Design a binder for this molecule. Structure first.
Ligand code: 1YO
Length: 190
C-alpha cells in the first residue's frame, strides 16, 4: 500500500497536462548541455529505457526556457528530425560534458557532427527551417507547463514531476519512474 511521499520523493502538479495519444505512458526527461547530473544518469537510464515494454514511451526533450537554454537544445531536435537512428547519441553528451567545446553555435555543432557521419548541408538546411521551430515551440510551452524549474527533470504523463534530487539519488529516480508508470497504468488497466 504505497511506499513514497508526495512532495518528498515526487511532486504532483495541480494543473496536469494531457498527452497527445493515450494508451501508452509518457516519460519525458528534460536534460541540458549544462547539467552534469544528466551525464551520470545516462549509463543508468539507458539499460532501463531500452528494456521498457511496448506500454511506455521515452521522449528526449531539452530544457528550452528561452535565453541560452533553448540554444543549448535545438541541436538535439535537429538531429532527431534528420532521420538517424542508433547514431551513437551518447557521443554527443560526451563532447558536451567531457570536452565541452562550447557547442553553442551551429558552426561548432556541424563541425563536430561531421566527424560522426552528418551532412553539414542537411543539418543547416533543416536547422534554419520552420520544421525545427515547430518542435521548439511545442516543447517550450510543455516544459514550463510540466513545472520544470530545474535540470534534469523526469516528468510522467505530465502529472508527476521528480528528479535525482527529489528522489534522493540517480537510482531512486529510476524507482520513482517505474512506480509512477504503474500508477498511471493502473488508471487504465483494462
Ligand atoms: C514536444 C515534442 C517536440 C519534439 C519531438 C517530440 C515532441 C512530442 S512529446 C509531447 N507532446 N505532447 C506531450 N509531450 N510530452
Amino acid at each position: 500500500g504505497d511506499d513514497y511521499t508526495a512532495g518528498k520523493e515526487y511532486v504532483e502538479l495541480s494543473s496536469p497536462v494531457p498527452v497527445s495519444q493515450p494508451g501508452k505512458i509518457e516519460v519525458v526527461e528534460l536534460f541540458w548541455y549544462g547539467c552534469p547530473h544528466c551525464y551520470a544518469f545516462e549509463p543508468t537510464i539507458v539499460p532501463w529505457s531500452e528494456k521498457l515494454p511496448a506500454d511506455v514511451h521515452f521522449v528526449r526533450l531539452p530544457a528550452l526556457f528561452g535565453g541560452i537554454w533553448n540554444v543549448h537544445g535545438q541541436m538535439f531536435l535537429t538531429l532527431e528530425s534528420m532521420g538517424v537512428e542508433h547514431d551513437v547519441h551518447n557521443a554527443v553528451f560526451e563532447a558536451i560534458h567531457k570536452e565541452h567545446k562550447k557547442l553553442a553555435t551551429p558552426e561548432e555543432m556541424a563541425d563536430f557532427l561531421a566527424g560522426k557521419g552528418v551532412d553539414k548541408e542537411k543539418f543547416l538546411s533543416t536547422y534554419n527551417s520552420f520544421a525545427i521551430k515547430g518542435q521548439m515551440e511545442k516543447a517550450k510551452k510543455l516544459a514550463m507547463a510540466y513545472q520544470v524549474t530545474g535540470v534534469p527533470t523526469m516528468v510522467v504523463n505530465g502529472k508527476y514531476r521528480f528528479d535525482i534530487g527529489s528522489a534522493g539519488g540517480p537510482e531512486e529516480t529510476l524507482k520513482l519512474a517505474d512506480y509512477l508508470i504503474e500508477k498511471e497504468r493502473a488508471a487504465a488497466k483494462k
